[model samples]
Target: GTILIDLSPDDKEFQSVEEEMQSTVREHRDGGHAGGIFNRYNILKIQKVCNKKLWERYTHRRKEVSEENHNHANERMLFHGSPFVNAIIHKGFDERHAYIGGMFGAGIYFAENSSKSNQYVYGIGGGTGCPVHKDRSCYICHRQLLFCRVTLGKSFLQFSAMAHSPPGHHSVTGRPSVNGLALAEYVIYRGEQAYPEYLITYQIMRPE
Candidate 1:
């Protein structure tokens, strides 16, 4: 016997919203020059996209589940992340199974929990000495405390967590800071299959 199944109807309005979100990201990337040169404007644009995406995946999705998971099967997804994080997630999953072959030389993290409630989560990694190009200028500023966010499903979402300076220090240096100082290390996870619960292995490279 043939089995029949019903799928949720498509939401045009929501669909448009999703397309606009993707378009915004594309516009941001197009405006920026190559070689990881992200200015304040570029950073803000990315922040906006990250905020909206989080709300959709974490806030709106849950709200719908209360009624009945509003299925947006037609909803196209957008993948984004910073260079470091992006490299981690996509490293060995490629054809060459190479370690440092991806964009950032590492793999980024993704969510994989059975419980939908725990599917969406976030983590914060605090690092000192991050470089911030002030006012979109070529000059790089230093000692800028940077915070990077890690999330399930969604890629890296970096927003300025905070900045620190000594008291009465009105004129701090404006050079971009660097994260190579190793001042801090952090990662966040929740639900089943959380961090420190997984295993790591190294083996001969396998062809994809």
Candidate 2:
């Protein structure tokens, strides 16, 4: 069973999360999307994901990696663009849906900048084809992204996206646009290495 913890507006982290994401949106104007001038995103709701078994698996993996001798278990909060919020909270991150030619291999892909992850945000909140809703659906269309806790046990720098890690590395990372990649990437081959900690929904704010 998946639990979605709705965040309260009064919660300090609520505003913090919203502001942080909004500020980090793609500078495509300097570089822009969501069709022409429509890539700008405004957050609607931030829900915390609570799946005991899923979380334990992630945390245990982190602990195991962090305890490795002379190994770095630097953990970080990363963003991943996804439309399948329901499937994720239910099954966690699955590599089965992972892209075969993904720049960093067939692994969970994350972005260092919110704007990069923002590109993948799509679809509505809860209705037909949406898993976030059970009773009624809303008129305001919503798009979502994941704020994941990634356990980058030991990271390796790579230029191309391969099928697997080189060796002795828990994750893969690269600089922004390095090798022509659009955004900074963090990749882990195993689903257990990341916890889909938050589901952030955004609504249409500008004139369409």
lDDT of 1 by residue, 111-160 (tens): 11111101111111112212443222232332111112222222123321
> Highest TM-score, which number?
2
Worst 10 residues of 1 by lDDT: 113-122
Candidate with maximal lDDT: 2
Model 2: per-residue lDDT, tens digit, 40-95?
A: 56678999899999999888888888887255568888888766657988898777
The models' CA-based lDDT, in order, is 0.22, 0.68
Cα displacement (angstroms), candidate 2, residue 47, comes to 0.7
TM-score of each: 0.18, 0.78
